[PDB]
């Protein structure tokens, strides 16, 4: 249902409207450069060097009987060297020969082939490829030997116990020189710090190095001989790729950093608040360094902002560090093991900036186009304003062009009951000119007083005025009332079509674009959970459950 029949009037007073002339453009972020440098948490255990001392006592049972010899007993007695004579094994590498042993007041002496109380030399033995370096001193009967061994060791993070590469575990901190409350659980009196006496590393025997201090703990069987250090040699932080050309952005809640080479983008929690380190004191030397250098090679483009190197902490746990630039004229952290969370953020950030600038314009180009559309809407009003004011407003209105403003009014409806039409376009005075439009007759609402007037375009009727043209030869033309058309051949209602199925013109530029369809993602995987367990060359769960199957035969019967 469209707008119905109506009649308009009142050129005098309505409301007032004026065409605008100065429509502006109501259009719709800052960023600093930087030199960031990021650290991750450390997992590598701490290491050092070590050297062990031991001395063997053997008891091998040889039997000389009647039928056959009985090669039976194999006895190991590794014995520990006292403190006051180890040093000769290090200086010119000479080894003591006899064993001196006391037991419960008694004293026993076991010489080695009527041995001497004076020392003997040694010789390096064979060994495995990149294995353990070890030197020996020999090339029920009794024989003995000394042994020295050189190897590596490693310990875990919160300093409970350190374990060598062979299995001689011993519960003590590697940083304990007395009078320092660290973790320590050995019994008593097994410590010595003989201050600055040197060890020579078997290439020569005469050179004198600095020779920092050394501890001499023995359990009772084997003497460990590492060298101690102060407890700033294990920083709990480690290095990573340092970028060069980042750019920062502060919006709303927190900051975003965006690099461009490693195409990542980190994100932090607080807003400005510079956290300061507490026990990360080792790493400040490396970062007071090497910020320069990266400052140095871009000297002709930027200046410093301030000396204050600031720190941050991100969500997954990676402490940052960076200093701002400007253009010029002329405990622990415990990070979470994954990539692809500092990676995905690029795919959502660097797609945001591209789409937003594309929608940056076309808000500009749409505005500039509408200024030119406004001007065309002025000159149409000077032709016939009663048509063009209707479509812009929304309903059937009327106006009558007073001066340089528009004269909006309100029309009165007419009853839908009885409409008429005239059967002849001829003026009923003579054989002269004719009307051009089919004048009709009508009546008001609820009063039944009938009038007549002229039907105009778009089923609007104004009264008390005619219009005509000169009659001529035969040329038909159509008209269009409510929901139908009907043809005049020359001056008669010759036909009535009553179908609005005559072909239209179809002027509509179809912006026929698309939607965005929703594909789903599969779940692929590069290295299965089962496959990781078979990666080790040893079968730890195969050895032990086989060893206690042929060793339950001690209970024979």
């Amino acid at each position, epitope marked *: 249902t469209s707008f119905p029949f109506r009649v308009c009037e009142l050129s005098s007073h309505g409301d007032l409207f004026r065409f605008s002339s100065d429509i502006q453009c109501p259009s719709f972020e800052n960023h600093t450069e930087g030199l960031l440098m990021v650290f991750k948490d450390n997992i590598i255990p701490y290491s050092f060097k070590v050297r062990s001392y031991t001395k063997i006592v053997t008891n091998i049972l040889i039997y000389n009987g009647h039928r056959a010899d009985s090669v039976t007993n194999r006895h190991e007695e590794k014995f520990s060297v006292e403190s006051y004579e180890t040093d000769q094994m290090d200086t010119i590498y000479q080894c003591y020969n006899a064993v001196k042993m006391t037991k419960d007041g008694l004293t026993r002496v076991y010489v080695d082939r009527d041995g001497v109380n004076i020392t003997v030399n040694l010789k390096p033995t064979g060994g495995l490829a990149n294995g353990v370096r070890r030197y020996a001193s020999q090339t029920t009967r009794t024989t003995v030997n000394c042994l020295i061994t050189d190897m590596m060791a490693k310990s875990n993070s919160p300093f409970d116990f350190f374990v060598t590469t062979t299995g001689q575990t011993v519960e003590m901190s590697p940083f304990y020189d007395g009078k320092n409350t660290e973790t320590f659980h050995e019994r008593a009196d097994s410590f010595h710090v003989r201050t600055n006496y040197k060890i020579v590393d078997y290439d020569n025997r005469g050179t004198n190095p600095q020779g920092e201090r050394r501890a001499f703990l023995d359990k009772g069987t084997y003497t460990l001989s590492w060298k101690l250090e102060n407890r700033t040699a294990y920083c709990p932080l480690q290095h990573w790729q340092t970028f060069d050309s980042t750019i920062a952005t502060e919006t709303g809640k927190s900051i975003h950093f965006v690099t461009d080479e490693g195409t990542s983008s980190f994100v932090t929690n607080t807003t400005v608040g510079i956290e300061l380190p507490d026990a990360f004191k080792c790493i400040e030397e490396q970062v007071n360094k090497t910020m320069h250098e990266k400052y140095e090679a871009v000297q002709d483009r930027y200046t410093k902002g301030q000396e204050a190197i600031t720190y941050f902490i991100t969500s997954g746990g990676l402490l940052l560090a960076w200093l701002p630039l400007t253009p010029r004229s002329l405990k622990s952290l415990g990070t979470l093991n994954n990539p692809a969370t500092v990676q995905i953020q690029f795919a959502y950030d660097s797609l945001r900036r591209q789409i937003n600038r594309m929608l940056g314009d076309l808000a500009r180009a749409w505005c500039l186009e509408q200024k030119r559309q406004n001007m065309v809407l002025r000159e149409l009003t000077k032709i016939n304003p009663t048509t063009v004011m209707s479509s812009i407003y929304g309903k059937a209105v009327a106006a009558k062009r007073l001066g340089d403003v528009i004269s909006v009014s309100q029309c009165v409806p007419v009853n839908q*009951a*009885t409409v008429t039409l005239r*059967k002849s376009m001829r003026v009923p005075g003579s054989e002269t000119m004719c009307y051009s439009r089919p004048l009709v007759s009508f009546s008001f609402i609820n009063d*039944t007083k*009938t009038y007549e007037g002229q039907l105009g375009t778009d089923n609007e009727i104004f009264l008390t005025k005619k219009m005509t043209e000169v009659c001529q030869a035969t040329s038909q033309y159509y008209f269009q009332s409510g929901n139908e058309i009907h043809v005049y*051949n020359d001056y008669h209602h*010759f*036909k*009535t079509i009553e179908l609005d199925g005559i072909a239209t013109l179809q002027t509509f530029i179809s912006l026929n674009t698309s939607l965005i369809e929703n594909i789903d993602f599969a779940s692929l995987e590069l290295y299965s959970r089962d496959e990781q367990r078979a990666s080790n060359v040893f079968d730890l769960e195969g050895i032990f459950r086989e060893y206690n199957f042929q060793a339950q035969n001690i209970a024979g019967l």
Partner: antibody, heavy 119, light 110 residues
Framework: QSVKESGGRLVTPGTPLTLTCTVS????????MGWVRQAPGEGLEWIGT?????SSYYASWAKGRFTISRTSTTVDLKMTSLTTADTATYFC????????????????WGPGTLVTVSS | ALVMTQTPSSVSEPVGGTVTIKCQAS??????LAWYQRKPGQRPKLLIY???TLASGVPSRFIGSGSGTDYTLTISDLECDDAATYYC????????????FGGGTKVDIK
């Protein structure tokens, strides 16, 4: 001139019956026809008549029933679905100006044939 | 829509008598219409339409006029065997109505 008629026949209820208005010696185009009925005991009636070039209009009683058409030689109303008490006489009329003015009584038409449905 | 009405049709007047019969209109068509005249057993006859336009072969006694919303027929001293039946119609408003007439009347002899 005048016209003669045909199609009058007794019938049972439930049957569509047509007619034919036989024209005689005048313009097929430059006039408009007409139809009126009257059973003895009442007066003149509805129909409302043909347009000169094509589709026409009529009264509001039997909208959807009568499918009156036209060829270049005759005119005819089609009575498809009917009732029973209507037993009257049809007349192929002829108007002059606007829907029967100048033929206000009517100008020239025929004596008509009586149709009647009755068991 | 428009609706046609009419005075009571009972009239009893002899030769030398007349007719006083009119029909009325509800909504004003501004009176463009005619009457109806027909011998029983015969086709209706053409007569004067449009209140001033006498047709061919019309009788001189049959005169009736008016204006506004209605006309009136009034024919003095009719002869014997004429005694026709009559009604009107509504002219210039041919549509969206259920009826084109509204009744009928008859004149007889005494």
């Amino acid at each position: 001139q005048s016209v003669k008629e045909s199609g009058g026949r007794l019938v049972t209820p439930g049957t569509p019956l047509t007619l034919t208005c036989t024209v005689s010696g005048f313009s097929l185009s430059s006039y408009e026809m007409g139809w009126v009925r009257q059973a003895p005991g009442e007066g003149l009636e509805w129909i409302g008549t043909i347009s000169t070039g094509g589709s026409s209009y009529y009264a509001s009683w039997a909208k959807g029933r009568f499918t009156i058409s036209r060829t270049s030689t005759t005119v005819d109303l089609k009575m498809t679905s009917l009732t029973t008490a209507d037993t009257a006489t049809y007349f192929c009329a002829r108007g002059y100006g606007g829907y029967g003015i100048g033929a206000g009584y009517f100008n020239i038409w025929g004596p008509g044939t009586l149709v009647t449905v009755s068991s | 829509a428009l609706v046609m009405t009419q005075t009571p049709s009972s009239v009893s007047e002899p030769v030398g008598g007349t007719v006083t019969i009119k029909c009325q209109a509800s909504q004003s068509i501004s009176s463009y219409l005619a009457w109806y005249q027909r011998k029983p057993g015969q086709r209706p006859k053409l007569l004067i339409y449009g209140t001033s336009t006498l047709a061919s072969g019309v009788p001189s006694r049959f005169i009736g006029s008016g204006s506004g919303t209605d006309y009136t027929l009034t024919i003095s001293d009719l002869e014997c065997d004429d005694a026709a039946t009559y009604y009107c119609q509504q002219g210039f408003s041919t549509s969206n109505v259920y009826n084109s007439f509204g009744g009928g009347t008859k004149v007889d002899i005494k």
